[PDB]
């Protein structure tokens, strides 16, 4: 008897056990194999890492050291893929991307 | 005596301290992150449930999660997520 939770055995930080419990209680299938929460936790951890790193870079080019939802909106809306995933998603207190159409500028 | 709420705010902070050691996060941004992880979880899990139901199978395996990631996520995002899931499953079934 011991240690070694399933996240540490898979080298992750997202909980494999909680994801397995949510997959079991979420009424998705009759059975859940014990590789599906590992894959699922890895995918969620990768997506969280990508969004958090892009938002940290957006905060870093803002002379700031704390991520606000504006930085998350700037991270998501500046990417083709990410915007596509979260294209029908509203972020609270995120604002919009700063853009003006070129015909509105004076000349 | 009221019951406790659970979220991803502890693990998301761990991933943040991996990818950015000297960078904090506000509570509103943590709420955005929790909603994001929940939304992607429901999307992938529902997609994989539909994949298992179409093929007359009764279990969700990592193959169903891989196909759901391929269907849901766009190109290079899906490629790197498949890479991460494959590496984690290979690492998990070795100990």
């Amino acid at each position: 008897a011991k240690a070694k939770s399933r996240s540490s055995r898979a080298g992750l930080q997202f909980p494999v056990g909680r994801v397995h419990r949510l997959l079991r209680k979420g009424n998705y299938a009759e059975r859940v194999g014990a590789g599906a929460p590992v894959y699922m936790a890895a995918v969620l951890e990768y997506l969280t890492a990508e969004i958090l790193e892009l938002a940290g870079n957006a905060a870093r080019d803002n002379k700031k050291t704390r991520i606000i939802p504006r930085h998350l909106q700037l991270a998501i809306r500046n990417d083709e893929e990410l915007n596509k995933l979260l294209g029908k998603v509203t972020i609270a207190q995120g604002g919009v991307l700063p853009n003006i159409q070129a015909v509105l500028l004076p000349k | 005596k009221r019951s406790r709420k659970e979220s991803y705010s502890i693990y998301v902070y761990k991933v943040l301290k991996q990818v950015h050691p000297d960078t904090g996060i506000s509570s509103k941004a943590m709420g955005i992150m929790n909603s994001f992880v929940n939304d992607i979880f429901e999307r992938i899990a529902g997609e994989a449930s539909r994949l298992a139901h179409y093929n007359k199978r009764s279990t969700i395996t990592s193959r169903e999660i891989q196909t759901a990631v391929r269907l849901l996520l766009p190109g290079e995002l899906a490629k790197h997520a498949v890479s991460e899931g494959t590496k984690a499953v290979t690492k998990y079934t070795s100990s």
Partner: single-chain antibody, 226 residues
Framework: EVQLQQSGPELVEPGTSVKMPCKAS????????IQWVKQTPRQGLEWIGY????????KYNEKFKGKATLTSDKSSSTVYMELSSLTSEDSAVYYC?????????????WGQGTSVTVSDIKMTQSPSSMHASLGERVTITCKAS??????LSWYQQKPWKSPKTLIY???SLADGVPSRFSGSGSGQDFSLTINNLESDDTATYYC?????????FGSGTKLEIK
């Protein structure tokens, strides 16, 4: 499938400007950044900049700001580079390279390289050149200056040819690369291992970081067979 078409060699007198196109085909053009690097005999490969056609977002090297400008044409699926005020040390091979907006991804596909002829993290590679037989094991070290969280890539370049991507994310194999090449290491210490060689491994090998804002290439290791 993915092609990065370019122009021929441009002989240019000093003082004027020069244009280089990067007509791209085989993929969704707006979803991938186009990055420009230059190569000289004197100092090797160095990263000039990039242009993201999704929002036309540019980012240049600090030593190439003003010297080089980048534009994109979405209708023709082309990326244009302007170099202005060509001095004497501007005769170089200019490469454009596809790279996804994902941080893990690297310069996977390259252009042919336009030869222009005019009338920070330090990369330390310990072996400058080495010789090997037809079946032994080669190890190339790429100790870096600062900390990069596994954001290192390994490239193979034939003479008078575009560089070929071998390793991305410091351990992962590129598309079509066999399992003889193996990347290893993390943090500051990285290495590339060739398991058993062929006659096609006579090439120059480079390591590139993209963890920081200015991307820096390696010094280059020449590998000559028998």
């Amino acid at each position: 499938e993915v092609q990065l078409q370019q122009s021929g060699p441009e002989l240019v007198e000093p003082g004027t400007s020069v244009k280089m196109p990067c007509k791209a085909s085989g993929y969704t053009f707006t979803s991938y950044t186009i990055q420009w690097v230059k190569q000289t005999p004197r100092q090797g490969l160095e990263w000039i900049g990039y242009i993201y056609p999704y929002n036309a977002g540019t980012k240049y090297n600090e030593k190439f700001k003003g010297k080089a400008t980048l534009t994109s044409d979405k209708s023709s699926s082309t990326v244009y580079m302007e170099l202005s005020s060509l001095t004497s040390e501007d005769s170089a091979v200019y490469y454009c390279a596809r790279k996804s907006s994902r941080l893990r991804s690297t310069l996977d596909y390259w252009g042919q390289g336009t030869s222009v002829t005019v009338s920070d993290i330090k990369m330390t590679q310990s072996p400058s050149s080495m010789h090997a037989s037809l079946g032994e094991r080669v190890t190339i070290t790429c100790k870096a200056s600062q900390d990069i969280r596994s954001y290192l890539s390994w490239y193979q370049q034939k003479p008078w040819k575009s560089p070929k991507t071998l390793i991305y994310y410091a351990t992962s194999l590129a598309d079509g690369v066999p399992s003889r090449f193996s990347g290893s290491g993390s943090g500051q210490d990285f290495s590339l291992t060739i398991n058993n060689l062929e006659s096609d491994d006579t090439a120059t090998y480079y390591c590139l970081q993209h963890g920081e804002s200015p991307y820096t290439f390696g010094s280059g290791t020449k590998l000559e067979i028998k």
